[PDB]
Design goal:
part of a larger assembly, 4 chains, A alpha+beta, B alpha+beta, C alpha/beta, D alpha/beta, C: alpha/beta, Rossmann fold, 60s Ribosomal Protein L30, Chain: A, Helix Hairpins, 3 domains, ten-stranded mixed sheet, two-stranded antiparallel ribbon, 12 strands, D: alpha/beta, binds guanosine-5'-triphosphate, binds phosphomethylphosphonic acid adenylate ester, binds guanosine-5'-diphosphate, binds nocodazole, Stathmin-4 (chain A), Beta-tubulin_BS (chain C), methylation (chain C), GTP binding (chain C)
């Protein structure tokens, strides 16, 4: 039961008690994903418009 | 109407509980994967405790205590007894035991041998039994015990073998006592008033630990290898009334005084010890569980705990009463509809 | 601003649509002249969803009235709230559709559809942020069925990213005008399978049974049937029109109700079904799940609910509402699919409808709706096997193959429901 | 002094953020108009509260916050609310059409069209910081915006602020207070995409907050207003160390250092006590021992789970009010002998303790009673994996039938993203099991 690193100020205090010792994607890659999803939306809409044109 | 699911088809006990629940006209059985249940009769292994108690508006109850395995595994029980101050390594009702991992895998090898050598030098009886969770070896030589465990792959326990057991007469035969104990959602501890002695039908032979038929009392071992099976009692099962009458006629004492007081003490010690770790008092779901305690009795009428079974079966002629009791104390107490136990 | 554009087509569509606007106009405090006279600012908070504001605090329904003959819209314009609609939004021809899907969809309707889209475009262009469209029509006639589904197809071409919901009256031989209703309905159902996000299936037989068996009306009229539809449409649109716990637009509502794109045909219900004894929450909840309160003439016990929504209206206990819904689900535990967790949702709105202290509206997405399509398919086949009454359709340019395909399409729909009923 | 920028995404994030900043103003003596009489350095200063508030030459203290939602109705209540004068229009960003509870709509369809505007508004705030620590991000798991746009924003923040820390406060979905059914999809999708971009995430299960509100505040049917006031108290307990003088958790980096030794396992469990009904005539004030013991009751946790059946990697105790170290040590020693508190073998069995003498502030006319001392425990326990298991199982039930999947594919998402996200969660559940369970 050791208390270590005790710090005190006017607002409070802090300390540590030890009970026992031990034993990214780039901007370019994000844009490609966003544009690939947008292109799939465009393809799916184009297919719908083709279906309605028939 | 109350709803429940069945997830262990191999349970004789809860197959009967399931039967009784339907026959009340107020319980409906759902498919095993339906989450909108009131009562789960769960599987023995990997029960999904983390998914219980998250269905809005449903009070959910399960027939197993999460964490009770600590008591119902042989190596786990040894460690619990040694490392729990409530029980301690000086525990007087549990045979001296040591956990031994096979060399091909902490371990207590050198601690066992240290005590083994102390017994040999002191002329004291030095018979031990190795077992785990067939698979049993009784020997008076440490070399044969440690070599048997290494050939295996799972953790084993070496335990002092009760060389001086109480022997029923006639027959000069060994036995063990099974007690059924129900712990409800409030952690009341209920001991079923009816126990059973799993008797051996072969005379006890201290000079031959090789033939494991008068030394091992398991019902399966007696049915397959014992040529006197059923000789003295039906199915090698003696019940308390007869056993009590025997203790009076032969030893001038009662089952309550000579044995049951110690049994109740042991059951209460074990279950009170683990209560803070498994209690569901303030949990979002609630548990109950049926336990099977196995006891040995030595010739001084001292009772020893052998093991605790977390998924026990019942004696054929006791299923009706005990299963109804489970419904009354464990289920209907939480889901009321529209004593056979001793409260410890 | 979550505007909705309303369209009503044909005789049934315009008669049920007119009642819908009378009901919600009363709820929002709008009188037959389009002037507000309510007592609560709750009535104006979402008035813009269905009404446009004109000069002088005048509210004009965002409604387009369509027909191929002038008769029914002359009745609307002379009705109670007839003067509330924008005169420019009456679009009608003179020839009629003769209860003929082909006339509504391919010949007479084709000649009028462009002028309807012109009005739709004008209403949409003045929307801050269009939620989507709703259409009222029957499937058994010619204009609502044939021209209504033609309109839906042309709206999807022009507004492909907008929700399209329909209140669709299904024909029944017990409440029938002509024998060709199964042909018209089978042709229309396939259009709806492809081009709507929600279709409320309102079976005229169910409406009749409710009026006769439950409301004790010896001789129900179309007016009595339409009072049930009007009340149901008010409840279904309640969370769009009044502030509450739900702030969902049409798309969010559909996302959480439609797990598969073709299975968007809903069984609606209402309680209380028309007295001075207000209902308790237990009674509301039991009746709204009762088959007798359903309007699709399908037994829910014959299928499984994929999703359910229920909205409660009035001053009542949320806790008791929650408690009763739990009670109904355990009694029907076998009738909810297990692979859509938490698939029964409820909402409450403080404002009750007119003449009631509390009510509940039920929206069920149930595979039992396949019974409705099976009925139609059977009646279709009984005539089509003999090619009976087909000359009315081939005379307008259709050929038998298009009937064969419509039949196959609806038998596929039925099969798709049976698949998920056994999942 | 190093600044922190708060970002509130979607309805849940915006309404919780509104509750937090109200509470911050009450804690620091800042009036709704932004004026702060106790700040004697007009138009400037590098006090601790300045990590969250900038200052204008006129003496107004402005939150370092951005609110983002894809429809305007929730943010409009900030613009016209009690604290409208606190924020300026550049901080409040609204679209026209929301994500309809569709992750794919918030991340791909709408996210692509608004992400650059949101980064420009954030850049404006960052240009006003001398030493930006990083970001605090508030959002729901279940909303289409809270899930989908948050994960896009987190990815871009890693790009534009590589060295800055990012912490999350995430609302985990509870059916009791939700009318959606696709939330398990949205939760797994956003967790998968955000896991590598978040340094420390505090999950709050609405089920836990709902039941605390019913059980301890005697609210029969809690509303979002009730829930958010309680959540904002817990959030404030967690962020107080950044806004007041002190030596524990004084910068965002310290949260990870103190609570997250394993980068993927960065979801600490929060527990808070006491929660007392203001309607209660008078309540006997709880002692340090009693509120500390309450930190080990599942009934007080922000996520319902059983820490007795997991292992601890770290534990921080954050006290506010009349608390002195001696009583904390006495309470801890007692609890060690009565509670099941198992640490992993590769970590010290210990507690980092922080005490702020100012007792909890409560919103006047709220549901919470004023107390003389309170505590929030932050513990990284493997038991929180139960919450992932629940979510993953609901995901599996629906995905086996592909229920609702067409809504996501329709917005340009590929089906493979579902299985990829679910496999990441499966690996996460395995990480927790390796860390916390013995054979
Ligand atoms: N605690 C709390 N949870 C909320 C609040 N608002 C919404 N939620 C929860 O958040 C989830 C719904 O997501 P929202 O935040 O409303 O959705 P969104 O982020 O605005 O995204 P959209 O789909 O575009 O509307 C559900 O689980 C709600 O219970 C709130 O104010 N407080
Ligand atoms: N330490 C010991 N001393 C004496 N006999 C012992 C013993 N340990 C075990 N036995 C005997 O061996 C038999 C089987 O032991 P054990 O209880 O390990 O088997 P088991 O796990 O199959 C019992 P159950 O079938 O109820 O689970 C017991 O019936 C007992 O008679
Ligand atoms: N419920 C209801 N059904 C109607 C009404 N009018 C017609 N129907 C039904 O609608 C079908 C006839 O279609 P109808 O709308 O009259 O033809 P249309 O003008 O060409 O669209 C038949 O099934 C009728 O039973 C009505 O006012 N209410
Ligand atoms: C014009 O079309 C509609 O009004 N569609 C619609 N209204 C709905 C209302 C609900 C509804 O009231 C509830 C949703 C969740 C709980 S009650 C659900 C789905 C709906 N679809
Ligand atoms: Mg055993
Ligand atoms: Mg007609
Ligand atoms: Mg939203």
């Amino acid at each position: 039961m050791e208390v270590i690193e005790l710090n005190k100020c006017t607002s409070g205090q802090s300390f540590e008690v030890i009970l026992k010792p031990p034993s990214d994607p780039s901007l370019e890659e994000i844009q490609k994903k966003l544009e690939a999803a947008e292109e799939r939306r465009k393809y799916q809409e184009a297919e719908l418009l083709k279906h309605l044109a028939e | 109407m109350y709803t429940f699911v069945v997830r262990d088809e191999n349970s004789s006990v809860y197959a009967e509980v399931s039967r009784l629940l339907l026959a009340t006209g107020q319980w409906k059985r759902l498919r095993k994967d339906n989450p909108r249940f009131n009562l789960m009769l769960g599987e023995r292994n990997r029960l999904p405790f983390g998914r219980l108690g998250h269905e809005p508006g449903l009070v959910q109850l399960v027939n197993y205590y999460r964490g009770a395995d600590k008591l119902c595994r042989k190596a786990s029980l040894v460690k619990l007894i040694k490392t729990s101050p409530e029980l301690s390594e000086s525990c007087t009702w549990f045979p001296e035991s040591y956990v031994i991992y096979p060399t091909n895998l902490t371990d207590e090898r050198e601690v066992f041998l240290a005590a083994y050598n102390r017994r040999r030098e002191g002329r004291e009886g030095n018979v031990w039994i190795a077992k785990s969770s067939e698979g049993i070896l009784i020997s008076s030589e440490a070399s044969e015990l440690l070599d048997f465990i290494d050939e295996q792959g799972q953790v084993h326990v070496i335990q002092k073998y009760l060389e001086k057991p109480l022997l029923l007469e006639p027959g000069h035969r060994k036995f063990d006592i099974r007690s059924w104990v129900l712990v409800d959602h409030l952690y009341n501890i209920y001991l079923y008033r009816e126990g059973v002695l799993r008797t051996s039908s072969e005379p006890y032979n201290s000079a031959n630990f090789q033939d494991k038929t008068c030394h091992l009392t398991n019902h399966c071992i007696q049915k397959e290898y014992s040529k006197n099976y059923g000789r003295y009692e039906e199915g090698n099962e003696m019940f308390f009334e007869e056993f009590n009458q025997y203790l009076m006629d032969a030893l001038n004492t009662t089952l309550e005084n000579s044995i049951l007081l110690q049994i109740k003490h042991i059951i209460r010690s074990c279950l009170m010890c683990i209560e803070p770790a498994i209690s569901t008092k303030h949990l979002h779901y609630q548990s109950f569980q049926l336990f099977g305690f196995d006891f040995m009795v030595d010739e001084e009428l001292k009772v020893w705990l052998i093991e605790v079974n977390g998924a026990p079966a019942c004696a054929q002629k006791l299923y009706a009463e005990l299963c109804q009791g489970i419904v009354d104390v464990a289920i209907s107490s939480v889901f009321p509809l529209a004593s056979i136990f001793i409260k410890l | 601003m979550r505007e909705i554009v309303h369209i009503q087509a044909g005789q049934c569509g315009n008669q049920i649509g007119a009642k819908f606007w009378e009901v919600i106009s009363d709820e929002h405090g709008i009188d037959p002249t389009g002037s507000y006279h309510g007592d609560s600012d709750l009535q104006l908070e979402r008035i813009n969803v269905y009404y446009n504001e004109a000069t002088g605090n005048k509210y004009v329904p965002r409604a387009i009235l369509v027909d191929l003959e002038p008769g029914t819209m002359d009745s609307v314009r002379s009705g109670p709230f007839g003067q509330i609609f924008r005169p420019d939004n009456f679009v009608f021809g003179q020839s009629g559709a003769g209860n003929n899907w082909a006339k509504g969809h391919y010949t007479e309707g084709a000649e009028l559809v462009d002028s309807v889209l012109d009005v739709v475009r004008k209403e949409s262009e003045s929307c801050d942020c269009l939620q989507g469209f709703q259409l009222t029509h029957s499937l058994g006639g010619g204009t609502g069925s044939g021209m209504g589904t033609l309109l839906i197809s042309k709206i999807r071409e022009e507004y492909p990213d907008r929700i399209m919901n329909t209140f669709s009256v299904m024909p029944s031989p017990k409440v029938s005008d002509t024998v060709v209703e199964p042909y018209n309905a089978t042709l229309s159902v396939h259009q709806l399978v492809e081009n709507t996000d929600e279709t409320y299936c309102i079976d005229n037989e169910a409406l009749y049974d409710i009026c006769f068996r439950t409301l004790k009306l010896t001789t129900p009229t179309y007016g009595d049937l339409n009072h049930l539809v009007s009340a149901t449409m008010s409840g279904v649109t309640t969370c769009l029109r009044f502030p509450g716990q739900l702030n969902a637009d049409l798309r969010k509502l559909a996302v959480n109700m439609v797990p598969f794109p073709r299975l968007h045909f809903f069984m609606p219900g209402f309680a209380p079904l028309t007295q001075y004894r207000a209902l308790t929450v237990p009674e509301l909840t039991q009746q709204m799940f009762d088959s007798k309160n359903m309007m699709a003439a399908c037994d829910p016990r014959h299928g499984r609910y994929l999703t359910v929504a229920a909205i409660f209206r009035g001053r009542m206990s949320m806790k008791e509402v929650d408690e009763q819904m739990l009670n109904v689900q355990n009694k029907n535990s076998s009738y909810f699919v297990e692979w859509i967790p938490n698939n029964v949702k409820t909402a409450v709105c403080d404002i009750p409808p007119r003449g009631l202290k509390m009510s509940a509206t039920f929206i069920g997405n149930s595979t039992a709706i396949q019974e409705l399509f099976k009925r139609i398919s059977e009646q279709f086949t009984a005539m089509f096997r003999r090619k009976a009454f087909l000359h009315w359709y081939t005379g307008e340019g259709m050929d038998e193959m298009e009937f064969t395909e419509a039949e196959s399409n609806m038998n596929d729909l039925v099969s798709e429901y049976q698949q998920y009923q056994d999942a | 002094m190093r600044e922190c920028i708060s970002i509130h995404v979607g309805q849940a994030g915006v309404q919780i953020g509104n509750a937090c900043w109200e509470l911050y103003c009450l804690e620091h003596g800042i009036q709704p108009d932004g004026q702060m009489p106790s700040d004697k350095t007009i138009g400037g200063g590098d006090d601790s509260f300045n990590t969250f508030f900038s200052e204008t030459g006129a003496g107004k203290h402005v939150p370092r916050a951005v609110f983002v939602d894809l429809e305007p109705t929730v943010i409009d209540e900030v613009r016209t609310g009690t604290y409208r004068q606190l924020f300026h229009p550049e901080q409040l960003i609204t679209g026209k059409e929301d994500a309809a509870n569709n992750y794919a709509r918030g991340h791909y369809t709408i996210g692509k069209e608004i992400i650059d505007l949101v980064l420009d508004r954030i850049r404006k705030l960052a240009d006003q910081c001398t030493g930006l620590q990083g970001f605090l991000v508030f959002h729901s798991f279940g909303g289409g915006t809270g899930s989908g746009f948050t994960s896009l924003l987190m990815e871009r923040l890693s790009v534009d602020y590589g060295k800055k820390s990012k912490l999350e406060f995430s609302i985990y979905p509870a059916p009791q207070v939700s009318t959606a059914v696709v939330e398990p999809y949205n939760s797994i999708l956003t967790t998968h995409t955000t896991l590598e971009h978040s340094d420390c995430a505090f999950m709050v299960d609405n089920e836990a907050i709902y039941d605390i509100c019913r059980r301890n505040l005697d609210i029969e049917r809690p509303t979002y207003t009730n829930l958010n006031r309680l959540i904002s108290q817990i959030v404030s307990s967690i962020t107080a160390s950044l806004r007041f003088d002190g030596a524990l958790n004084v910068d965002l980096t310290e949260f990870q250092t103190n609570l997250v030794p394993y980068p993927r396992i960065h979801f600490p469990l929060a527990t808070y006590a006491p929660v007392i009904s203001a309607e209660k005539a008078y309540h006997e004030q709880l002692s340090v021992a009693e509120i500390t013991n309450a930190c080990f009751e599942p009934a007080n946790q922000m996520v319902k789970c059983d820490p007795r059946h997991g292992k601890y990697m770290a534990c921080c105790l954050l006290y506010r009010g009349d608390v002195v170290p001696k009583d904390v040590n006495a309470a801890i020693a007692t609890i060690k002998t009565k509670r099941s508190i198992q640490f992993v073998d590769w970590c010290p069995t210990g507690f980092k303790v922080g005490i702020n003498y100012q007792p909890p502030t409560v919103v006047p006319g709220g549901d919470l009673a004023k107390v003389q001392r309170a505590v929030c425990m932050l513990s990284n326990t493997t038991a929180i994996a139960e919450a992932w298991a629940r979510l993953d199982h609901k995901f599996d039930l629906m995905y086996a039938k592909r229920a609702f999947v067409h809504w996501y594919v329709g917005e340009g998402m590929e089906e493979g993203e579902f299985s990829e996200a679910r496999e990441d969660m499966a690996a996460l559940e395995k990480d927790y099991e390796e860390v916390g369970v013995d054979s």
